[PDB]
Design a protein around this nucleic acid. Structure first.
Length: 259
DNA sequence: GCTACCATCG
DNA sequence: CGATGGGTAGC
């Protein structure tokens, strides 16, 4: 009975003072993938490293209060990979992998390119360097879940006003069909869309105007699953009862057995 | 303060 | 449509 959550905490300390720590236990989650810690190893308290006795593994950026992802788990990972293996994106801490035998879960914070053009390009090199990486993992022959902020909305149904954002970062054509290739060419399963092909399921809302209140949001938080495991998904939900961030926790369940 | 991260008006 | 301005966490 497996349960995985993907939450972009927008600063783990802020989220913790907004009630995320209690949520980690309350949700009953077995594995929690968090992105955008906005903190370093020294900035982390004991509770932000091993919440409720869970094991934890993180990858922080060089500069302070920026990016950083982590993976918490009720069980001890028999393996852990920090960073992807490339200097350019590993100096930003955007990747953590945890192997639990046959299972393999990953917290990922794909770079955003909405700040500037150069950021957009770094995002593209990230796509071009992470693409073959996705392929390798598929050919490993194991159950793998890739949770995180991909900062890309796949189709028109994945965001409220898809008309005004066709020229903006996160919903550019080449991005959209980069994701399209990730789903079809490699056979990765966009779990939410597969479980519910007609439900928007927004996971992020801008700080602008009445974005959150009017439900003008994006679905940029994913759990890309392998087929043999994707077929074991039983349900999914976007938690919005409490607000720990501008993002919302993505909860997915799997009829699974670790034995 | 500064830096990084598209909804709303005309 | 295109032009115009943002709240938030952390340094």
């Amino acid at each position: 009975m497996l349960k995985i959550i993907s939450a972009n905490v927008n600063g783990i300390r802020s989220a913790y003072k907004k009630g995320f720590y209690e949520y980690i236990a309350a949700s009953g989650a077995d594995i929690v993938c968090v992105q955008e810690l906005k903190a370093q190893e020294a900035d982390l308290s004991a509770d932000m490293k091993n919440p409720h006795g869970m094991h934890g593994h993180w990858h922080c950026a060089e500069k302070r209060g920026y990016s950083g992802v982590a993976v918490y788990s009720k069980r001890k990972p028999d393996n852990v990979q920090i960073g992807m293996g490339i200097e350019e994106f590993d100096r930003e801490g955007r990747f953590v992998r945890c192997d639990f035998g046959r299972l393999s879960v990953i917290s990922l914070y794909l770079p955003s390119g909405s700040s500037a053009e150069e950021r957009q390009q770094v995002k593209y090199r990230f796509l071009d360097a992470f693409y073959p990486m996705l392929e390798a993992m598929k050919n490993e022959g194991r159950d793998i879940v890739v949770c995180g902020d991909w900062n890309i909305a796949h189709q028109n149904i994945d965001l409220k006003n898809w008309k005004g954002n066709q020229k903006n970062s996160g919903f550019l054509p080449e991005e959209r069909e980069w994701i399209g290739k990730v789903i079809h060419k490699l056979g990765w399963t966009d779990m939410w869309r597969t479980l519910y092909p007609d439900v928007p399921g927004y996971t992020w809302w801008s700080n602008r105007g009445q974005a959150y209140a009017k439900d003008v949001g994006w679905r940029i938080d994913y759990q890309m699953v392998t087929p043999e495991l994707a077929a074991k998904a039983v349900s999914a939900h976007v938690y919005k009862d409490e607000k720990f961030s501008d993002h919302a926790p993505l909860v997915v369940e799997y009829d699974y057995a670790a034995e």
